[PDB]
């Protein structure tokens, strides 16, 4: 529930620590955590809001110019000086002009001309600094059980670095403890929050500082003072006897293409909502109980109300309607083959299905994991058990291949953190995570300033290099190539 | 034996040490502050070093304040303050390596 | 030369950069540097302001 149709959901099965399971929550999909005798819980990260950001260096992308003026000197005099060069609101430029004996200077060299124009800025854009503190994540979790396809089954958890751990209380189901890592989530110490005109981005530092545009420096208080004041003013000169000042055009469509690989964000009031990150939580399910045990079996009748449907991962959701007034009651349901010997094959994802109301025609939804052959969804007790025919497509080998592809994509997206998704904890997992940290630091230092094409080019180049170098470094090249080219062809 | 609150944050100095400022709500008189740096909240095993004294609150009033500084390990960790079921915790990440 | 009424402006480690209103005046010499800050000084963060 809440994760049935996500198409990017991940199943975290069982626990070997007995109590807790690590998990990395991402904005794209969600995680269904299923223990041995505990209810399946679907956990998703919904929003990350950043609060009270501090302004840094608003740039100016649309300039306007004003009353130009100029000054000039005979070929053998000093240099031209306009009294508006002592004003920090004027852009001024000095050049040499052909002068003499016709213009009113008796000498024939090159005189000095100074032209000044008053600079004003419309439509500054502004960046703000994010600190890993005062950054809040919202986690929504829900429980399986009695909920129909459409409150003791859902919970919302707010997590900030001040309170990184929380407990979601699900009445009658107990409570799920989460200890999470909010600081090291998405690196918000190199990322500014940029706004141009009611459009906000998550932008890297050291891109918001190498921009060639007239920039203020934080606290705009009175008369704004733009520092570069050029990069929007072009000083042309006519045939050695004039000078002209023009402004460059509005620069907002050049920045839109300069941004590429910078995340979009939205803003509510003083807070900025990001819809792309990843949090890491350890889930302590040791106070999670099964509400439904010690219930008598439901024996009246069951009718399929929608149909059995297949999610994108192979599981089967089934919505049933119960006819008898029995009360809180446990639903018999299974997957079977050879309906003479009803031997439970496959696994059922709902931890325990239970009908929780005492009315005539109640509704419930369960989900189950069928085997790969043809099978029968059997729901009922005896002489009134409805059976639906089910057919699952692909053998176990395809499942293992898809699992490796998902793992590779998760590694390419999360970097080293990918080793923490089933991180119950072993020497092998820790060794893999460590050597991946070393190799990731090295790879990000060497490469990582490339963008899907520089990486493809260098990948093909090094691929030829390792293919025909004939030394023992063949393997080093080809492995770096595996890395680069998959980093390209998986995103 | 009372509850602590984080008055500001656990700031990070330039050399990696954390400064934590805590507020005490109980009135037990001069009493030791139970503070540690831990991972795996299940088994609270003290990791890192606390470059502070066996931190103590001096006053005996309703709300008092304390500042202690810690030398945490290079991984992610949790500042654990308090004894049980009231121990506030903060998430803290250190960058360097040995 | 002769010098006159000095003034200064400081900011916390994670803010923008300091800006005096007398930087937009072409009669003042201004210099910008980094200063130790934090908690004691009165701004809560410990970097260089």
């Amino acid at each position, epitope marked *: 529930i809440r994760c049935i149709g996500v198409s990017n959901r991940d199943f975290v099965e069982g626990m070997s620590g007995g109590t807790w399971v690590d998990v990395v929550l991402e904005h794209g999909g969600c995680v269904t955590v299923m223990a041995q005798d505990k209810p399946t819980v679907d956990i998703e990260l919904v929003t990350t809001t950043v*609060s*009270n950001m*501090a*302004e840094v260096r608003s740039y100016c992308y649309e300039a306007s110019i004003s009353d130009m003026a100029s000054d000039s000197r005979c070929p053998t005099q000093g240099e031209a000086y306009l009294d508006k060069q002592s004003d920090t609101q004027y852009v001024c430029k000095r050049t040499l002009v052909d002068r003499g004996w016709g213009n009113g200077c008796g000498l024939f060299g090159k005189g000095s001309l100074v032209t000044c124009a008053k600079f004003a800025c419309s439509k500054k854009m502004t960046g703000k600094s994010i600190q890993p503190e005062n950054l809040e994540y919202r986690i929504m979790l829900s429980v399986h059980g009695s909920q129909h396809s459409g409150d003791e089954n859902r919970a919302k958890v707010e997590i900030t670095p001040n309170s990184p751990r929380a407990e979601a209380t699900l009445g009658g189901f107990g409570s799920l403890g989460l200890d999470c890592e909010p600081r090291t989530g998405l690196d918000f110490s190199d990322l500014y929050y940029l706004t141009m005109n009611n459009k906000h981005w998550l932008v890297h530092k050291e891109w918001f500082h190498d921009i060639p545009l007239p920039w203020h420096a934080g*606290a705009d*208080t009175g008369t704004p003072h733009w520092n570069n004041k050029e990069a929007l003013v072009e000083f042309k000169d006519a045939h050695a006897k004039r000078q002209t000042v023009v402004v460059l055009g509005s620069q907002e469509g050049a920045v839109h293409t300069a941004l590429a690989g910078a995340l979009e964000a939205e803003m509510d009031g*003083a807070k900025g909502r990001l819809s792309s990150g990843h949090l890491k939580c350890r889930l302590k399910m040791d106070k999670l109980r099964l509400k439904g045990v010690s219930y008598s079996l439901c024996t009246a009748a069951f009718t399929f109300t929608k149909i059995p449907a297949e999610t994108l991962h192979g599981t089967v959701t089934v919505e049933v309607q119960y006819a008898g007034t029995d009360g809180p009651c446990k639903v018999p349901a299974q997957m079977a083959v050879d309906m003479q010997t009803l031997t439970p094959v496959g696994r059922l994802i709902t931890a325990n299905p239970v009908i929780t109301e005492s009315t005539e025609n109640s509704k419930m939804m369960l989900e189950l994991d069928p085997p790969f052959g043809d099978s029968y969804i059997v729901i009922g007790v005896g002489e009134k058990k409805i059976t639906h025919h089910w057919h699952r497509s692909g053998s176990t080998i395809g499942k293992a291949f898809e699992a490796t592809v998902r793992g590779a994509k998760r590694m390419a997206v999360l970097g080293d953190t990918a080793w923490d998704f089933g991180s119950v904890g072993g020497a092998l997992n820790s060794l893999g995570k460590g050597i991946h940290q070393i190799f990731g630091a090295a790879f990000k230092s060497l490469f990582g300033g490339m963008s899907w094409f520089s990486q493809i080019l260098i990948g093909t180049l090094l691929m030829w290099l390792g293919l025909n170098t004939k030394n023992g470094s063949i393997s080093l090249m080809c492995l770096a190539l595996g890395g680069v080219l998959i980093f390209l062809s998986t995103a | 034996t009372a509850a602590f609150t984080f*008055t*500001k944050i656990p700031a990070e100095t330039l050399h990696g040490t954390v400064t934590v400022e805590v*507020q005490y709500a109980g009135t037990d008189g001069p009493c030791k502050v139970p503070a540690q740096m831990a991972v795996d909240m299940q088994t609270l095993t003290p990791v890192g070093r606390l470059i502070t004294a066996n931190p103590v609150i001096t006053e005996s*009033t*309703e*709300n008092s*304040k304390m500042m202690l500084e810690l030398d945490p390990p290079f991984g992610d960790s949790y500042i654990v303050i308090g004894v049980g079921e009231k121990k506030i915790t903060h998430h803290w990440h250190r960058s360097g390596s040995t | 030369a002769s010098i006159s009424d000095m*003034a*200064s*402006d*400081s*900011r*916390c480690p994670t*803010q923008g950069e*300091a800006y*005096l209103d007398k930087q937009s005046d072409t009669q003042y010499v201004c210099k910008r540097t980094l200063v130790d800050r934090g*908690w*004691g*000084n*009165g*701004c*809560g963060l410990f970097g260089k302001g």
Partner: antibody, heavy 127, light 108 residues
């Protein structure tokens, strides 16, 4: 303990100049900076400036940059504030407040508890 | 220079809050926020410094908070001897002090 006592109230016609003292007792006068704060009748408080009693540096507010001079007398443990060219707006109460000076002898950053002790006040009436 | 409410009233026994809105140079960026209480006739008395922190001989009822550009003084358990003027002050980034407009609290 710490006691800052100012001179008594004073009445002056416009155009004149007032000089109000602030005698400090109960602490080392040389290691503190004295601020002067003016409060209009039933209005906000106005910070006017400070003087570092150690070396003698002063800093005045922009509103009084060229109307106020603050001096000190260490041997007598006094801080004087002189305001010239009085106006009808200057009818207000003048307080003096201490603040600890850094251990290096400079007063760049103030200590978190700036105005821990104040003076009783002195009414200057501009008629 | 600091935006403070004109007056605030509350019945004895309940909590109340006085806000103080400043800019990114005085209250927004610095923990240099102080609250002074002034009974009529007497000089102001430092009730809170360092935002939350408060002096030695001050009742624990006064609390301080800060969010963005707004500081806030909270008085829980409003007693009798609380009718006075409350002023917020801040040390600006440029090295000057600014005070608040003033709030007259009435315990009724």
């Amino acid at each position: 303990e710490v006691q800052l006592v100012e001179s008594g109230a004073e009445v002056k016609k416009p155009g004149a100049s007032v000089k109000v003292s602030c005698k400090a007792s109960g602490y080392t006068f040389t290691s503190y900076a004295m601020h002067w704060v003016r409060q209009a009748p039933g209005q906000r408080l106005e910070w006017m400036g400070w003087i570092n009693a150690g070396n003698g540096n002063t800093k005045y507010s922009q509103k009084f940059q060229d109307r106020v001079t603050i001096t000190r007398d260490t041997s007598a443990s006094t801080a004087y504030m002189e305001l010239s060219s009085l106006r009808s707006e200057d009818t207000a109460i003048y307080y003096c407040a201490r603040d600890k000076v850094d251990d290096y002898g400079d007063y760049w950053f103030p200590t978190l508890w700036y105005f821990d002790y104040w003076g009783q006040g002195t009414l200057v009436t501009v008629s | 220079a600091l935006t403070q409410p004109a007056s605030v009233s509350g019945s004895p026994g309940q909590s109340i809050t006085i806000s103080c809105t400043g800019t990114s140079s005085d209250v927004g960026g610095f923990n240099y926020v102080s609250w002074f209480q002034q009974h009529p006739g007497k000089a102001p008395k430092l009730m809170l410094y360092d935002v939350t922190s408060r002096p030695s001989g001050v009742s624990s009822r006064f609390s301080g908070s800060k969010s963005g550009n707004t500081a806030s003084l909270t008085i829980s358990g409003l007693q009798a001897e609380d009718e006075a003027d409350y002023y917020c002050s801040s040390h600006t980034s440029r090295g000057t002090w600014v005070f608040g407009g003033g709030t007259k609290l009435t315990v009724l």
